[PDB]
Design a protein around this ligand. Structure first.
Ligand code: D6T
Ligand code: NAG
Ligand code: NAG
Lengths: 566, 107, 118, 566, 118, 107
């Protein structure tokens, strides 16, 4: 299999002019300075950019590129996108269960894994965890071996590496490339780009393309690249790396001067006479949701210190509120206490949902490369990770608050009023978490969104009803009291709990209330805050929250759907 | 605000008869309701405070039994001097609206 | 406990309105709130606004900017000052008394009538 | 001047064994892998580590190292520590104002700087801003040119560069090193270390020391370093970097095998016969506090988007609280509103002072390198930067919250109560800021301290008196209500504001209160919260916060004083 | 409005104590709170604890765990149940009545005397 | 809690004399103070509620003028039937402590 590209004018600003060449099965290479097209000609030939900038044609063996080009070729990201909490056996099963056909047996699927991991020489680390901040794992020299094998699953004809040596040691990098040249003799074409190689690296290549500042400066065999620049009018001294010598000519021991020398080359015409010789989903839905939710759940178990910690904080802050507010008294101070803790329990659900920004932001570079390669659909990605991360880690702490503080404080001692409180803190937990997915989706930085979640809640906190009284806001602001998540929770806990209570000892007020301005029953507190007494007035909040969940997750759906994928 | 409603805007009763006046609210009042009796040509005079209690200077033929939103007033065996105009007042919020008022008559 | 209105029984449109209620038998800086109630013909009563015992006040939001209530604590008087009058509110005006801890209009003035014509 | 070191055994684990060599005036370089001693031999010879680990001697021209060695030598950090928001003219005046004595004239000191900046060739950027993220500044190839001149102010004989090429471009670094060889012929003994140089770099050296894994593996003239290893048993091919060839030996084309080869050298024996021939504050306190506070004040104005922003945040949020709580009524809802806004103001002062963690953490490596260089005292650093950054950026928002909202809300319209509220928000802003310096100072990460500031406030917030009632906590938790900064401000604001108020309209309650459970006056709200009515009870809160400033800044001082400076 | 204590006028130490106050003229589940007041010789009065109209209760923290107050709404009685008695509190016991919105001990029982000896 | 103090633990007065009893608190009570009068052999009977108001069934020779912490009681021209025992009560907090009580005498 060979590539052949011709007359590409890529723009966003044309940062490419006209680049020509074939790529034989061997060791194709792209060298140059980081400002040039060493990372942009690669993404064009790997179909990773916008096709609107594309001008020329990219042909395979006489055939132009189909839409099956991505599923028939492997691209490997510069940094590792591997699941550092899964083992290499687990990741290669995950890649196999989403890319290969469903007709294959697991006994067929395991052997295809077993050939690859032996081809990578990874039998000694075959069940070792890869490595996280909190788990000692396999060294960085074989994380790169893992990621290449993730794209060796389909056994493609064409491989795309992006900087396979940047980030490793020099003794590490030769071990990677010697493995690659052994792949090159098997018939798999390898296309990569190295930042500043060594002569021990450069002695192994089979074809070289030297790019700088959007101009093709060399194309041909890498052995004849040094002798070309000897015949170009330069001299390479003794004991010098030729790859350093190639970038030495770039910076002046000028760009358009050196390109025109390449125009009059015998290597250019041989490329020119060759390019005219040639010129003239897979898997169903429910299967995708099974393996994706399986993956993120082991990620949730495999990183305990981000998930156990939210349980421990919930228990400890559960007990302290249980200790401070120990059994509440039906006296004049009872209204201040009961409306205090219910304001603390609702707002605790909101501000602890700022950690849900971490959900799609850290997974973003993994989300993009898996979707362009097409392991799943976006609708299948979204319903899985909601089921795996968001759904259990919010059901748990809302029960832990509910089990601890309810009978220590001594709230309304009925059957349903225990469960209505439990259900309410569950709903307000999702709604604040859904707003986090509404904002944090698509962005790549954490601190801008983590700021912005803090901004939105402290305005929602004002209108909740404890700081300001919601009946006496000026009328051109009292429509903002509908846009706040914590109001609907805090109203529901107030409606659940202040019904049959009394707060003036010695004074039966629920038949007649002489001497008013008194607030001697729960209703007179509950009306003065502007809250309905009907049983609809309870459940009006829950349908108000549930509508906010569906809207915010839809916004969370579409922002992943319309993202700049290229 | 809180608007009030006395949908029986009139009556036509006989002497010694038990009549009942209803006053409907546009919200919860929680027994913060009143009743006034205006003869033709005088100021309104307080009849019932707190929707149950009664004022010194009236017989115990008047009685209010209110709960939630539906407040009412009952005159059992009205005399001749009970003809006039009746008003209901919320004093829950600040813009203290009154009811539209009803006016008893004798056939 | 004992109230009495006084003022002009007629006024030009769009000029002013002034009333005066002189409380005897009590000191108006002592306990109560003191408020104004007007009553339109085709009887629908309508509350206007109170001045507190300590000079603070609160007005009906239907009558924005048109009403202001001041007091003279030297002789137990409190003044209604209604400006930019329309010929629609040719009502019967009352000064009244609010206990606060009981919550009802306990005492009511004799009542004066104001007519706005030309 | 010459260095000479002999028989160094440094420990923390002995990651150095026995290293011997002199450093003549010329260009002294240290190569090797990053795990070896290329970063730790430099810190020993520049007196930057603990002398408790050091064993061998360091001699200079026949004399051991005095206490004046840290002031008569120049050490240059790897990354830029320069004030990126100032200019190069202002930076070199800052280094001159704290190292040269107070005898010299400003005319004398500026000519010395003109000697430097003409020697560095920075005339075209002599009055240009250096560079931040928010300011387009001088290029990274000349930030390094700026920082080297900061140590050239005393005109020292001995220079210590730490990786002067790492981070620059390859054509960028040749401009730096050719300057250094031009510095070398002035007679300045230049000592540094390079992560993997180039042969165009390596041809400029004068003396070379190869270290790996705590063993001296070569030390001599850099010309013969290639010729030594051909006699060792290894062959260097043509078109190969000699510097990369040296680390190729380290990784095996073993450590103890190659080390004893160097002990039997003809070069080690010439070195061994050389050592035995040789062997056998500055400025007043008031002057320092000017220039430290002067530099950081320009840093405050030179970064608008971190300082002008908090003015904008103050005014905008100040108008919103002015809009929601527009003029407060003296009715039954009036208590809930007034205690609502005052709770929002005191916690807005506390929770926004988490930004003070940025103060001592970002400037930490500049603080450490300067104090070893001894530009100032730790007493002088700490009193200056508080006078420069913390003092003005907390006076401003407490005035703007005071000026805007006090007449939109219509609080107690007296002369003093405007200023008691103004003073109260200023102290509680300092008290929370002092706690932030008490935690942040000494740590190097932002996020761990920022999370710990977040946990400390939400427990202080419960005890403030709005959520729970303080007089009904059980008596074995009620001792915690004294540790809480938002209690003291909020107690003071409530005392400033609820004194001469009434809240039951139509009901004079201040002589007699019939029909209790009423809260018909400002005292009855204020006593029921557990707050004194005597004018001591107000100012008790201010002398409480004034003590918590003095305690926390002291803890902040001692953590800076007892820091591991090495 | 009308209260009356009854119970044993003597008891062994460290056994128990039971009293009974039968309210006539009113229903004890209607309005008031109902509480117990004891009075030591060498007169220093001391309040013990109330039961609310709706069965809730609140005890003096000086008498922790030793006191419990129950009621029988069928015949308007409410019971004092004092356990683990010392011979120090040989006081005079009273059942009393608390209006709540007025705040004072408005009505007081006839009063019984209890002596703890052997 | 809130402990109370009647530092005049006794008196020795004459008939028709104006006597004054002081009651000092260990905190603020804000006029939530009371007075009881116990004859020898009876239950305590309420005398003054709210530290200023007076109960129906007593002449206007009793008067309380309290403010802040220093509450007091004044008996102008005491009769013979005003001998007895007087107590002051806070009803601000929940453990309703009383004062130690004072006992008038005649010389
Ligand atoms: C005008 C807009 C604006 O600028 C703005 C407006 C207001 C504020 C603001 C609002 N505040 C606030 C916060 C909370 C409260 C009430 C307390 N409630 C209630 C209960 C509770 C419970 C919690 O649970 C324990 C909890 O904790 C959460 C859970 O934690 C668990 C941790 O587990 C993780 C495990 O990891 C190991 C938190 C809470 C918090 C009140 C005020 N404070 N500041 C900040 C603003 N921006 C900036 O200042 C800013 C800064 C830098 C910038 C830089 C550049 C540019 C601009 C920049 N701008
Ligand atoms: C309070 O009194 C009303 C009538 O005044 C009565 O309906 C009700 O039962 C009383 N409350 C309780 C808890 O018994
Ligand atoms: C309330 O009434 C008392 C009478 O005891 C008087 O001292 C006080 O001045 C009144 N309040 C005001 C604000 O005038």
């Amino acid at each position: 299999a060979v590539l052949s590209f011709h007359n590409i004018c890529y723009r966003v600003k044309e940062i490419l002019s006209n680049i020509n060449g074939i790529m034989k099965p061997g060791l194709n290479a792209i060298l140059g300075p980081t400002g040039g097209g060493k990372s942009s000609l690669l993404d064009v030939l790997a179909a990773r950019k916008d096709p609107s900038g594309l001008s020329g044609d990219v042909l395979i063996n006489g055939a132009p590129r189909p839409a099956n080009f991505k599923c028939n070729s492997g691209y490997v990201v510069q940094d590792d996108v591997v699941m550092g909490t899964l083992t290499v056996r687990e990741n290669l099963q995950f890649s196999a269960a989403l890319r290969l056909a469903t007709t294959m047996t697991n006994h067929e699927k395991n052997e295809r894994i077993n050939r690859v991991i032996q081809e990578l020489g990874l039998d000694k680390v075959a069940d070792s965890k890869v490595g996280t901040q909190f788990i000692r794992g396999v060294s960085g020299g074989e994380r790169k071996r893992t990621s290449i094998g993730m794209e060796l699953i389909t056994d493609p004809s064409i491989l795309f590496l992006d900087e396979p040596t940047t980030g490793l040691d020099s003794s590490t990098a030769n071990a990677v490339l010697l493995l690659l040249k052994r792949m090159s003799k098997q018939g798999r074409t390898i296309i990569f780009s190295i930042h500043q190689p060594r002569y021990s690296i450069f002695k192994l290549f089979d074809s070289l393309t030297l790019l700088a500042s959007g101009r093709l400066m060399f194309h041909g065999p890498a052995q004849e690249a040094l002798g070309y620049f000897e015949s170009a009018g330069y001299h390479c001294e003794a004991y010098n790396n030729p790859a350093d010598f190639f970038l030495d000519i770039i910076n002046g021991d000028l760009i358009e001067k050196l390109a025109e020398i390449y125009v009059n080359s015998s290597f250019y015409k041989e490329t020119k006479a060759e390019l005219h010789q040639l010129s003239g989903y897979t898997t169903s839905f429910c299967h995708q949701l099974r393996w994706v939710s399986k993956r993120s759940f082991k990620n949730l178990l495999g990183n305990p210190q981000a998930s156990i910690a939210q349980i421990i904080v919930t228990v400890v802050l559960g007990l302290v509120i249980g200790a401070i507010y120990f059994g509440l008294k039906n006296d004049s101070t009872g209204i201040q206490n009961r409306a205090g803790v219910l304001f603390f329990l609702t707002t605790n659900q909101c501000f602890s949902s700022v950690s849900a920004v971490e959900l799609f932001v850290v997974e973003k570079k993994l989300f993009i490369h898996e979707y362009i390669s097409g392991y799943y659909r976006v609708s299948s990605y979204f319903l899985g990770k909601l089921l795996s991360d968001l759904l259990p880690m919010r059901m748990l702490p809302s029960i832990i608050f509910t089990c601890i503080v309810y009978f220590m404080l001594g709230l309304k001692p009925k059957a349903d009023a225990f469960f209505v409180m439990m259900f309410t803190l569950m709903m307000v937990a999702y709604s604040a978490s859904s707003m986090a997915l509404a904002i944090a989706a698509g962005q790549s930085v954490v601190s801008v969104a983590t700021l912005l979640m803090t901004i939105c809640f402290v305005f929602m906190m004002i209108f909740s009803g404890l700081l300001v009284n919601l009946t006496t806001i000026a009328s051109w602001l009292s429509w903002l009291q509908y846009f706040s998540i914590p109001r609907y929770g805090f109203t529901a806990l107030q409606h659940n709990e202040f019904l049959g209570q009394n707060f003036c000892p010695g004074l039966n007020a629920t038949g007649n209330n002489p001497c008013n301005y008194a607030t001697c029953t729960g209703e007179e507190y509950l009306v003065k805050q502007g809250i309905d007494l009907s049983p609809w007035g309870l459940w009006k909040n829950h349908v108000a929250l549930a509508c906010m969940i569906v809207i915010f997750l839809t916004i969370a759906y579409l922002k992943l759907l319309f993202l700049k994928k290229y | 605000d809180i608007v009030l409603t006395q949908s029986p805007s009139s009556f036509s009763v006989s002497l010694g008869d038990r009549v009942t006046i209803s006053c409907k609210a546009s919200g919860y009042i929680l027994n913060r309701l009143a009743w006034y009796q205006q003869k033709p040509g005088n100021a309104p005079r307080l009849l019932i405070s707190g929707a149950t209690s009664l004022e010194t200077g009236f017989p115990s033929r008047f009685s209010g039994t209110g709960s939630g939103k539906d407040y009412t007033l009952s005159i059992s065996s009205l005399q001749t001097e009970d003809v006039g105009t009746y008003y209901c007042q919320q004093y829950w919020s600040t813009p203290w609206t009154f009811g539209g008022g009803t006016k008893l008559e004798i056939r | 406990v004992q109230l009495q209105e006084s003022g002009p029984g007629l006024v030009k449109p769009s000029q002013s309105l002034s009333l005066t209620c002189t409380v005897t038998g009590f000191s108006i800086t002592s306990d109560y709130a003191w408020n104004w109630i007007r009553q339109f013909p085709g009887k629908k009563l309508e509350w206007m606004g109170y001045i507190n015992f300590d000079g603070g006040t609160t007005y009906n939001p239907s009558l924005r900017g048109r009403i202001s209530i001041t007091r003279d604590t030297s002789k137990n008087q409190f003044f209604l000052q209604l400006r930019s009058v329309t010929p629609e509110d040719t009502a019967t005006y009352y000064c009244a008394t609010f206990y606060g801890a009981k919550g009802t209009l306990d005492y009511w003035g004799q009542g004066t009538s104001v007519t706005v014509s030309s």
